[PDB]
Design a protein around this ligand. Structure first.
Ligand SMILES: CCCC(CCC)C(N)=O
Length: 124
């Protein structure tokens, strides 16, 4: 699987809610770093963080506007949409850098966005 195909599939798994397929595309030592926050180091810690972030989320609808790769690094421009438990929807504009390991799994995922845009929507 090429890096672009891997990241494309990763996003599709978020969108379908196939969380295990999502994790399976990641290295065991994946670092998930939402840039304004502390990095999350390793798949076990990623599972716990995802559980927290998804607690009040019923569905994801993440749209890739642009994607480009340079070797093992894949860059994205996205709008990440969510539907919350009560049916409210929100979107956050984000760019992400993904790095793939020697096994072509995601070993780093760094997302860049405005913390205020995030806090507005994930408050309450
Ligand atoms: C980009 C800001 C929010 C993050 C974390 C999941 C809630 C995302 N990937 O959309």
């Amino acid at each position: 699987m090429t890096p672009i195909e891997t990241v494309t599939a990763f996003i599709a798994h978020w969108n379908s809610g196939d969380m295990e397929a999502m994790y399976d595309l990641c290295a065991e030592d994946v670092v998930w770093h939402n840039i304004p926050m502390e990095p999350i180091a390793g798949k076990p810690a990623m599972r716990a963080a995802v559980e927290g972030f998804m607690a009040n989320v019923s569905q994801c609808d993440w749209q890739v506007h642009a994607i480009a790769a340079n070797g093992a690094t894949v860059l994205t421009e996205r709008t990440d949409g969510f539907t919350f438990t009560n049916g409210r929807r929100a979107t956050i504009r984000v760019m992400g850098t993904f790095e793939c390991d020697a096994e072509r799994r995601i070993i780093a995922w760094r997302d860049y966005f405005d913390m205020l845009e995030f806090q507005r929507e994930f408050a309450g």
